[PDB]
Amino acid sequence: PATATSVDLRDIKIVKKLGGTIDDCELVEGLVLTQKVSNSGITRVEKAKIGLIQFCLSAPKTDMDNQIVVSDYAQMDRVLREERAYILNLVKQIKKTG
Amino acid sequence: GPLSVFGDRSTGETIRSQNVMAAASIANIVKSSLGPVGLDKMLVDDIGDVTITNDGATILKLLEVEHPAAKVLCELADLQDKEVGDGTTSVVIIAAELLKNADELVKQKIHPTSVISGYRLACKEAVRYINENLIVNTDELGRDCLINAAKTSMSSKIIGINGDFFANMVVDAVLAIKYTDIRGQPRYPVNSVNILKAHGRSQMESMLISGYALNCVVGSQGMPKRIVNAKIACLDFSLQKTKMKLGVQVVITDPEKLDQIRQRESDITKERIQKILATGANVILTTGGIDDMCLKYFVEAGAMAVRRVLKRDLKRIAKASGATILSTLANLEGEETFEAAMLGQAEEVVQERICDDELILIKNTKARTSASIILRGANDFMCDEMERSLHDALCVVKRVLESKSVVPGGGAVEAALSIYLENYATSMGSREQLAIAEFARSLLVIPNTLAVNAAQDSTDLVAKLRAFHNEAQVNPERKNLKWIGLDLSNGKPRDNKQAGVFEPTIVKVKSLKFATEAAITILRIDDLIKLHPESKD
Amino acid sequence: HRPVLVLSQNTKRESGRKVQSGNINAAKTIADIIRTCLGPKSMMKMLLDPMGGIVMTNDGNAILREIQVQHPAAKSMIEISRTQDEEVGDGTTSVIILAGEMLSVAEHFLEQQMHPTVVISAYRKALDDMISTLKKISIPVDISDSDMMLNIINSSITTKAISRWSSLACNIALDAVKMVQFEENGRKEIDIKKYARVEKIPGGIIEDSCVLRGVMINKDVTHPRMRRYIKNPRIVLLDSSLEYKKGESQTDIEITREEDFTRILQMEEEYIQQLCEDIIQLKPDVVITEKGISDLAQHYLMRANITAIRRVRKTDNNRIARACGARIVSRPEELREDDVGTGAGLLEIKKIGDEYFTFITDCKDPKACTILLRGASKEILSEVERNLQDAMQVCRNVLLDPQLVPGGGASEMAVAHALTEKSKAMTGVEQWPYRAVAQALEVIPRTLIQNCGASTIRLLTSLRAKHTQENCETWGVNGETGTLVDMKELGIWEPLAVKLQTYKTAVETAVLLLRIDDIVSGHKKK
Amino acid sequence: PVAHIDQFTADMLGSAELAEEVNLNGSGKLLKITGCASPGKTVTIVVRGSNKLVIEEAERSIHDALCVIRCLVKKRALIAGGGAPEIELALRLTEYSR
Numbered sequence A: 001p002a003t004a005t006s007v008d009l010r011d012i013k014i015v016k017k018l019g020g021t022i023d024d025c026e027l028v029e030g031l032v033l034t035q036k037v038s039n040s041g042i043t044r045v046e047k048a049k050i051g052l053i054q055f056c057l058s059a060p061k062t063d064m065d066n067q068i069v070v071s072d073y074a075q076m077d078r079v080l081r082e083e084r085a086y087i088l089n090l091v092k093q094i095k096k097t098g
Numbered sequence B: 001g002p003l004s005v006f007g008d009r010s011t012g013e014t015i016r017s018q019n020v021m022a023a024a025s026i027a028n029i030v031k032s033s034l035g036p037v038g039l040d041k042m043l044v045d046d047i048g049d050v051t052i053t054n055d056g057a058t059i060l061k062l063l064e065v066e067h068p069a070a071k072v073l074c075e076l077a078d079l080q081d082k083e084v085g086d087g088t089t090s091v092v093i094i095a096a097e098l099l100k101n102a103d104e105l106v107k108q109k110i111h112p113t114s115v116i117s118g119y120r121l122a123c124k125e126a127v128r129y130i131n132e133n134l135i136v137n138t139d140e141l142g143r144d145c146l147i148n149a150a151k152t153s154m155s156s157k158i159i160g161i162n163g164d165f166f167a168n169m170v171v172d173a174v175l176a177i178k179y180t181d182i183r184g185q186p187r188y189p190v191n192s193v194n195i196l197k198a199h200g201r202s203q204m205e206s207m208l209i210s211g212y213a214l215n216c217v218v219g220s221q222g223m224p225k226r227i228v229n230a231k232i233a234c235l236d237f238s239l240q241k242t243k244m245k246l247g248v249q250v251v252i253t254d255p256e257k258l259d260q261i262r263q264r265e266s267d268i269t270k271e272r273i274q275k276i277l278a279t280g281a282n283v284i285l286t287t288g289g290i291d292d293m294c295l296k297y298f299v300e301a302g303a304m305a306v307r308r309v310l311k312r313d314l315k316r317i318a319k320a321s322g323a324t325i326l327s328t329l330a331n332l333e334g335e336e337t338f339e340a341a342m343l344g345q346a347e348e349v350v351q352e353r354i355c356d357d358e359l360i361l362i363k364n365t366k367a368r369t370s371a372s373i374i375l376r377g378a379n380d381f382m383c384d385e386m387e388r389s390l391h392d393a394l395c396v397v398k399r400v401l402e403s404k405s406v407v408p409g410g411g412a413v414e415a416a417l418s419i420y421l422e423n424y425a426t427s428m429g430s431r432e433q434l435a436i437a438e439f440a441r442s443l444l445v446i447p448n449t450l451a452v453n454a455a456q457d458s459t460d461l462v463a464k465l466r467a468f469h470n471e472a473q474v475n476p477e478r479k480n481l482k483w484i485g486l487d488l489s490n491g492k493p494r495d496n497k498q499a500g501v502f503e504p505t506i507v508k509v510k511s512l513k514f515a516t517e518a519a520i521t522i523l524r525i526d527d528l529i530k531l532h533p534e535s536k537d
Numbered sequence C: 001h002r003p004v005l006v007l008s009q010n011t012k013r014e015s016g017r018k019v020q021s022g023n024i025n026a027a028k029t030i031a032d033i034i035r036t037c038l039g040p041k042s043m044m045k046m047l048l049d050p051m052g053g054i055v056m057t058n059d060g061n062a063i064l065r066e067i068q069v070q071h072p073a074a075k076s077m078i079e080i081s082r083t084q085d086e087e088v089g090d091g092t093t094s095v096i097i098l099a100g101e102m103l104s105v106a107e108h109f110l111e112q113q114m115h116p117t118v119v120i121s122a123y124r125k126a127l128d129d130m131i132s133t134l135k136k137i138s139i140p141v142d143i144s145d146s147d148m149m150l151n152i153i154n155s156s157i158t159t160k161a162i163s164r165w166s167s168l169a170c171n172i173a174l175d176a177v178k179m180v181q182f183e184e185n186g187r188k189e190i191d192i193k194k195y196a197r198v199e200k201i202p203g204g205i206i207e208d209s210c211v212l213r214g215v216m217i218n219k220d221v222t223h224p225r226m227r228r229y230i231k232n233p234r235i236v237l238l239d240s241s242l243e244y245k246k247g248e249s250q251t252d253i254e255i256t257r258e259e260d261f262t263r264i265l266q267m268e269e270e271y272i273q274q275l276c277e278d279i280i281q282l283k284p285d286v287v288i289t290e291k292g293i294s295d296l297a298q299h300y301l302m303r304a305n306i307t308a309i310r311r312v313r314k315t316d317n318n319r320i321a322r323a324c325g326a327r328i329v330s331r332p333e334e335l336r337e338d339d340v341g342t343g344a345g346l347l348e349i350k351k352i353g354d355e356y357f358t359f360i361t362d363c364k365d366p367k368a369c370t371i372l373l374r375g376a377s378k379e380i381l382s383e384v385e386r387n388l389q390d391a392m393q394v395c396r397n398v399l400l401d402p403q404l405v406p407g408g409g410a411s412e413m414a415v416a417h418a419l420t421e422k423s424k425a426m427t428g429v430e431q432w433p434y435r436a437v438a439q440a441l442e443v444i445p446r447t448l449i450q451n452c453g454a455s456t457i458r459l460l461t462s463l464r465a466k467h468t469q470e471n472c473e474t475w476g477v478n479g480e481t482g483t484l485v486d487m488k489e490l491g492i493w494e495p496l497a498v499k500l501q502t503y504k505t506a507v508e509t510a511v512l513l514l515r516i517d518d519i520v521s522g523h524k525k526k
Numbered sequence D: 001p002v003a004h005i006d007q008f009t010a011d012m013l014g015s016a017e018l019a020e021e022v023n024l025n026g027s028g029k030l031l032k033i034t035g036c037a038s039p040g041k042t043v044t045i046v047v048r049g050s051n052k053l054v055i056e057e058a059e060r061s062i063h064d065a066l067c068v069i070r071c072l073v074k075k076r077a078l079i080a081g082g083g084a085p086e087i088e089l090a091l092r093l094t095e096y097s098r
């Protein structure tokens, strides 16, 4: 206040959840998400650092049509083991950030 | 001239009288299934399925409704299962009688906002009075509080025997799944108890399996169905042939390299099955699929392999046996390591006979000592009733162990609140005192329904019930008459402290909060507009 | 057209005395259907199926499964007989008559302004006293004796249609359970449904029916050059195919040279010969698989003198794996010496009525057998198959619980006098419904004299006087003649697991149907 | 918003004193981030209820309450309510009509 004469109500998200009474309403200033946690073995972390990732942590694929040619006995081993080494470099890039 | 809407409009006291008859149409159904003298019903579908139940949530969920005031009371019973779990015939009768007595007030030209504000002064005072007039926590009674609170929930159902067979199995099940949390929270997750059904012997042969009871078969009939000192390997990936993905195709240019690729689909598959079996693992649980080629490696090595188990059942086994739920290969660019130190443990994995089916049991799990209950009934209609009655009994002991506070059941709470709120309405009552006075008469329908279903005296037993509760509030001579209830087998007021009729505190606190809040929304339908159904345009 | 402002549309509501006394008449109606199918003087009941078949039987379970009822309490009594059929063998018709009689005396107390919870609380106290009475009048059985086990199974098939061939059907059902009694680890199990297959062939006489020491299937040899009579074969069981199929991938071969297309057609023949060379390293005689066998695999097994069967079922492969002691493998290059079915006896491809049957019999110690039924037609062979299933399960209950109860009315009268003497110390409002449970047990000796045409007044007065003394206590009703003969001289004995399951299910059927005071019908679901 | 894994650094991360999945007793569970360094001009309101019809009315009543304070930012002036300015508009315009 005392700097602007306009206010957008789209900066106030309203989450509707069934349960309890109207006295159980909360004014948490942080982020409230309705999605689930996969995997849900932890579900709690203090001093957390949150990062928004728009990259897809999956198998390597391009916008163009991409195919894998397998014409050898040991070439099937070079497909599965290199896909595990691809995403491991993505997880260790995420883990070493903090 | 008038409104040109294509639907239907009804104003005045027409909808104000229709919402009360819509709420009384639901309450008159479930009034015959309340208390130890309550009786079950039959729910027959159009396809021929018969459901015999007496719980207030299972009846109103399967019953079709049309009125908008009827869907409020039906969804009110669904909220009682998640919040409390046994409090789901008593909320519907109170919330409908809250509208019946408020309809008599608005016919006296009393404004409904004074009835809404009058109900909030009586609902908040009822929670204030019940939290200052409790007897004792779970330290004095000990284990007698958990058994007597369990038998009160079973009295309205098919497992209400005179003995303590079903009562001791529920207390021993919740006490074996004590899962601690941070900041000193001894949580009791009652959803981890696998409740199974089997049409077998009588109800006195219900086994209390200390461990877990998996509802699956072994599959191949060449595996040992009993493994002593077993090591459970919990994993979630399909043990089938190595099928390439969509982005990978096999384009061969040499005919000599054809058969080496065809054998590679089974060699990579059997390479995983030999490194998970050489570490001493005897029991393998899989949520995916184990095809007929991979079943040979368990028959040859003498191991048990269970395929197509549920994902909700694998988490209850791996947490109770110390196993790690593994989905793929891992541990820092390793080829095949499997982290063999993280295998589960079990004393005995034995497939017993469950009357012409196969059922796998795990004994004590060596890590957490969980519990699972296998129910035994006459037919499938009793087994569906025994499952619903046991699940409501597990929710009673959960709230007592979490919130160490119990209230006397059998109409003892509703008798004390019927007289305290009449004195509360006289002190600070100027114009909203008539709504607080009708809040006390609406709460009296819970001991009134116990006298109707028992075919006892109605206007004399409840009149003798509130005679003891009136002397406990106006005569401070330590009369200790706050625990006076009803003996429906005899027809006289009894003391619920010595009789062992105990109910949790939040089975009546959350019941009075949900029924008062539901009565406010149905009290504001003075105008109602119903549009025509838009189906064929 | 304005809609009608209703609530709970197109459904019914019914409460009060029309539901409490309405479920009793639905239970009395089913008990009057199979009332003429309890004693040894019973008659068959011809039924008609919606598929076009005919079920001519007198067993209480097979009759109620062919009846489609619309009453909701009538659907509960059909599931009671299905529970008694899976737990024990000959525990069917007795529960439906007893649950109808326990509800017949329960309708009397509902008219006396008594609450239904008082009758159920008296039924549960009476149920706990019927279990303790049967355990006092029981008798230990020597399961090692052969002639003692023949008298138990003969008592269960005297009611059924195989009582005429009682000397043959008792030896078949006794040898069927004792062969499939397999114990690998420290757990005894008897599987008489997955391993004791009862196959029926139309033709011949019933006196030539016998339990084979091994298995049999309706399968011919794959090639006429293969042998149809091997003395001591080495049977190897397979699970995968002996053909060349497409892999589980997107395999595609680009053929640019001239020698490439002829090489792939030669590599398909060398792949079949590689897996055919891996199965002849153990020198077998009979190769049995579940999938197809190509003609290239039939050629290599022909000159190696190997008889191959093509499309044996998966349930038949699990049954022959217990008889010959073989291992069902699914990889021809992973065969071992333990996976070979040694110890198998004579193998012969016989023909019974213009159709070949593969016989694998004369085994040393088989853990699975096949009962060969031969009769007039498929109508009466379904009766003997349903009676042998009631004859093998009553032998399974003795091998797991060797205690006998004196049947033929002596079991019900020994407890009805025990409930009468114990009711003298009740002194309450539950005393009179406690007496009605002892009177409801009288319907089992009532049925044995109503089927043979004897008097129900002069006999029940003398039978009730025989149980006044504590010495004899085992006098029942002889259904053959119609007089009172002691069951120690006749030989009619029922197992403990049959009589305990009969009383536990008939009481809890009355427990469920007495707490029903409302019925809602007319709603839909998903 | 991090799109590529090569630009995923510690400067594009957030901060949270507690990021946990609050296991509710009603309709499932949600996330709740409590506390963050340099909080923005956003907030989240969690609305409860006993029925699904009360939450829809409580959502509209909260929006009718936030819009009242929204009018005070644009015009910092208020009048007496409860039929107060309608009488003054009825008496002053009657004298204006004369």
Ligand SMILES: Nc1ncnc2c1ncn2[C@@H]1O[C@H](COP(=O)(O)OP(=O)(O)O)[C@@H](O)[C@H]1O
Binding pocket: B033, B034, B035, B036, B055, B056, B080, B085, B086, B087, B088, B089, B090, B091, B151, B152, B153, B155, B156, B392, B409, B410, B411, B450, B485, B486, B487, B488, B501
């Ligand atoms: N032994 C008893 N004596 C008197 N009243 C009892 C006894 N046992 C149970 N009740 C009453 O029966 C009622 C059963 O309520 P119930 O239908 O289980 O509620 P919900 O539908 O919420 O589970 C309780 O309110 C309790 O007061």
Ligand SMILES: Nc1ncnc2c1ncn2[C@@H]1O[C@H](COP(=O)(O)OP(=O)(O)O)[C@@H](O)[C@H]1O
Binding pocket: C037, C038, C039, C040, C060, C061, C084, C089, C090, C091, C092, C093, C094, C095, C155, C156, C158, C159, C390, C407, C408, C409, C448, C476, C477, C478, C479, C480, C492
């Ligand atoms: N020779 C006999 N004398 C007297 N009673 C007999 C004789 N044979 C059979 N019974 C009686 O006939 C009854 C037949 O019961 P059954 O219908 O076979 O039961 P289930 O339906 O469980 O198989 C038995 O309870 C037995 O007491």
Ligand SMILES: [Mg+2]
Binding pocket: C090, C156, C157, C159, C160, C390
């Ligand atoms: Mg019989």
